[model samples]
Target chain A: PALTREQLYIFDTTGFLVIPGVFGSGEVESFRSELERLDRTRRYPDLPAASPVFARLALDDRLLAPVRDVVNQPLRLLEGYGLRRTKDSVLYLHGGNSELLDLGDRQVGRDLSITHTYHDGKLYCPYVKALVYLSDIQSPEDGSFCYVQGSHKANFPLLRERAERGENTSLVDSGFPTLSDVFVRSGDVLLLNEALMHGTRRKLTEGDRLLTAFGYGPTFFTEWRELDAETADLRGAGYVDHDVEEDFV
Target chain B: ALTREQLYIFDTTGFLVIPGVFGSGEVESFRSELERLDRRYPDLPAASPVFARLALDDRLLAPVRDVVNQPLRLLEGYGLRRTKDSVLYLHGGNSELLDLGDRQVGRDLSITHTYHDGKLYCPYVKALVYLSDIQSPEDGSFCYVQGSHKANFPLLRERAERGENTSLVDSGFPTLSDVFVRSGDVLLLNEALMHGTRRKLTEGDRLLTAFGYGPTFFTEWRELDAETADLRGAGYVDHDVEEDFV
Candidate 1:
């Protein structure tokens, strides 16, 4: 279903949206069990080919409302990943944590948004980002996602001064008293604009936050990550070049 | 006089409402003074004798200063930033506030992210007072998520630079109740508190005023902006008392 004008207006001002119960218990479990398995070994960028159900989740019609609304039409899953993190999630301060799991520290910042993500130097918040939680994130430490409210429209003097230093853009500063701890639940969904100045609050407890993230964009564009030259070739070769590939088993 | 009950409530919950801070007698003069202000400047926070006179009136300014704790400099600075921007919204006929639907909306958006340049912490106090009688719940008033001034709730802040207005339903931060007030009622708040206004159900606009009091360190922002600045004895924090914990 398309979101209400109010829903979009909220997104426009706030730069994010939360849609609950997008998935039910049964489907949620199935996704959890499989993603945990394939996360142990995965393939495909448009999404993991581990299970037919998971692959199609990115293009699922029901989950396509905000994304379709943003692009005004069909969108190709430019890339996707299965994330299975268990406790002690670190502050990916030196770089984006999103790329590590997708196995592309290089493609991040260009197309990969850290699970805690945002736009770069006035890059408008991305058209839309869809994230589905396959597990319950009740407590702040368990799976708290942090975002600076209304950061999408930021052009403030503070950021302008620090703009020269790369990646200094995202503030991991403990002094920020403004950080919002957003909790999630099993089967809950969150959609966002890439420009809202987002990131995750690290897991300080014992629990697993499992889910899939899909970045929808035009398929015609191909971006070769310049930082990871040796690994760059592998992404384009039309084959899974991951380390754990004890393949064709 | 400083009320311990009000002070504790403000500190503990990030906001508090003190009933009967203004009666019609006091309000009449204040209202008439403001009406005159409307003519000369066509903008709020205009520097005028009436505004200054009200600031000097102990009764009219006492409750606000008492809660904020001294240095109540009047009309230091003033202006309206703007909210209730989106006319199309859920709840209360395009109301400005929304009940934080689910406590799990795990992210917040701040409309003032770039103000301090995202670098400063634990520096000041902010408050609001009602200029009209919001006697009923449906009449619309401020909604605050108590104790949120310090929580990492993602339902607020940093929607500053380019971030736009997101709804409370989308905020996911929780609010147990909305504030109901009468004219002349004074409310003190922590700007960091997850607070916003509810839609006015009646055919009236809310006549409210905002105040901030803190050390010179943080008051620079509100230092000179008269409409939103400190009152008499504007910046006094006494560590001698237990309220110094702020």
Candidate 2:
């Protein structure tokens, strides 16, 4: 189903949106159990291709519909992976503004593939990620995902200024005042622009901050990892070369 | 004052069109005043008392103050009487991302659009006061790629490489939008957005006055013409505090 205009408006301005209860308790438990089953290998990176439930979730209309709308153009899956962040696991504040510039010793540069833009009622988000939360997140203390709200459109060098020549800065350490933590129940989904300043808070509670994220971009975008032909066929996904000029319609 | 929604729209789309800014009588008077001055591309706000007053007029500055939200300085204001057979090729966007080595030193952050702490901080903004109605595309109205202000990659890089300039008629961008305004209306533009003018196919010239505003700290772009050089004295090209508006 298409997103509502109100939802689109909020996403356009905020750069992320949480669609509540996309999966039911039964579905969540099943997906969680499947991940647990795969965790035996402990080499569970390709969980999306390894399990049917996760594979189904990847191609689920619930995820694709809004992502297709956000890119507003022909798009394909870039990569898919499952993450199991244990206590003390940390991903500092990164991407967004930091990705906008490269502060070398004597030169500065930019990468356009990771930009968020809106034009004529359509969004041109080059990279969009959909995360399905399989575990409950009721509070920030539960190791929730946090981001600097609207940092996708932020032109200031908050992270760039705070980050040393070769290091990543956490949200709290970065000193960006508008830091917001997104708390979601087990069955919720988050569609993110990836250009928004984002990272996971260190887990303080017991149990894993388990989630599966599938990255998608315009069909012309290069994949983060080259998936095997079997996995691509299983997920019904393929990537195009950056310079490919093929038409979707 | 602009409403919150208006500000959001501008922040999201990189431009805003405020309608009915001037009454029909006021537009007529200003239009006739430009004719009376009889200078082709006069240094407005400096060349004539009427244009000067219009430059400082609240109808224009109120939204500008809200958009810039800092002490403002007048960059340059001039009348453009774009007649038939003239076209403004699309230009001015994603310049910051261009890897020209010169920008590595003293790169101006103001040319970038950013939103934080509930304020829009723009370094360069233009208020184009339309002196005639532009009801149709043939009127040679303004057009731009909305939201190009926040663009990270050069969407038009391939076109530029091919020695083709993007235009209002053929931007090859789906986001291109033509702005239509009555004589009394005003169009506020962020200089970071890719923009240009369509060629006038109709009989009359597309008449408008453009005032460039930036933060007080930004140096004004220089004018080479003699009259503008003389007119570009202290008060004509510098900062004006909020209290100085009256």
Candidate 3:
């Protein structure tokens, strides 16, 4: 769906936008069951070719419309995969504020892959993630989506400062610039700026926090992996094969 | 003398907090003298002898020379007062990267931060000396977006135009760190860093003086021109002389 002015404003200022009800109840069940079936069979990388529902959902205007505005035009899928956060699973807060790294004082070439830059009233975020929740995240205990609000515009390295002080930068309880838990139900799509500092809370009572993640970057960025011929055809072109591991928690 | 660590921190953070720049007695004298003046914001040098001394002190200029890497000149200096309810919005972000010159496309070279090879070239810098303690973030303290001194891109032009400095909407910009300095401490700030002041909500007034310094080639702030000439006459600012090559 096309983003409203408020949604775009929030995304531009806060670094992420949550679009609810993008996926229907029936569609969530269909995607969840297929993911489960694929896990059991150890079959993967043909998701679009394997299921027409997945193919249609990948190209759906509801997802791409906002994605087009968040990221620059002429986009392509950089990566696509399923993620499962089991009980007690934790993914540390990462990305955003690249200056935190001690890559030395020497000058280096700029990386456009993860840049969250605004110019001429238009935002040019090269990397964006569209996460579709397949299960309900009622609270933080359910392994909710978590992030530091407005951190995409950060120039300082607050998290790194905490780490230097012998504190746990990854834990939400102790992390600097307190992380905000985003509680969303099934059938919700979260379009997140990949440059925003984000992670997931440790699961407490979850059977499994299942979600499908699709990396949508500008056409200038390189693809994360090579897709099979059939899947490639379903997803469209300008993709290069690279050895990239599937995202896991 | 500025330590290597201090230089490195200033190079990385855009603003460095230097403690004990002025002793307790010096702080009290300057504060008392300024309180007697009626002006809310007073230009320096001619305004008070204390302001002139602080502007030329080596404690501030030694490191500035190392960072700027050139013969120095007094650009501007002024004392400001912020009582309750005084608010200053964010300003001075990465405007150097924009095309502001007529028929030219590049940074405003005089007010920019550039580190090439192994040296830093900061043409414009400011020294803010606090006379009143700013112990709290909400005490109208100087706030800035760290590392913005070297920002590769600028903020939205319209956002900057909406306000005098930055966006009029003060809240929601993330990672904005307040440099809370005590009385007598100095905040050495690079002019390119995006910065502003938080509103003074407390009952106590905020007192400080800002002195801008730059390389000799840059134009001085118009307000400080008379004082700059006086400083040159007094040997606080030096001039370059060379004979013509035959």
Q: Best-fitting candidate, measured by lDDT?
A: 2
Candidate that beats the other on TM-score, 1 or 2, i.e. the better one = 2
- Segments in model 3 whose C-alpha atoms lie over 4 Å from true places: A40-52, A102-111, A173-177, A225-249, B1-246
TM-score of each: 0.38, 0.46, 0.45
DockQ of 2: 0.01
What CA RMSD would candidate 1 show?
21.6
User: Candidate 3 lDDT, tens digit per residue, A1-249?
Assistant: 577889989999888888999889988998988887776112246355566667667677787778867764335566666777777776667666443322122222112244455544456676788888888888887877788777676655544445446653355544444578898888999998977878777778848777877777533233454322212111222222111111211
Best by TM-score: 2
User: DockQ of all candidates, in order?
Assistant: 0.01, 0.01, 0.01
Report how far off residue B72 is in candidate 3 (Å).
38
Better of 1 and 2 by DockQ: 2
lDDT score, residue B178, model 2?
Answer: 85
lDDT tens digits, residues B123-153, model 2? 5789998999988767887878776677655
Candidate 3: RMSD over Cα atoms? 21.3
Chain A TM-score for predicted structure 1: 0.68
Please provide, for model 1 over A16-124, each residue's C-alpha lDDT reduced to its tens digit, 9 standing for 90 to 100.
Answer: 7787888889988887777555542233343544567766786676676566554331134544666766666633222211111122221111111211222211112
The Cα local distance difference test for each model comes to: 0.45, 0.64, 0.63
Model 3 - which docking category?
A: incorrect
How far in Å is the alpha carbon of B200 misplaced in model 1? Answer: 66
Error of 1 at B170 (Å): 53
Candidate 2, which segments miss by more than 4 Å at Cα? A40-43, A98-106, A164-169, A173-175, A225-249, B1-246
Once model 3 is optimally superposed onto the true structure by TM-score, how far is the C-alpha of residue B102 displaced, in angstroms? Answer: 34
Q: Report lDDT (Cα) of residue B198, candidate 1.
A: 51
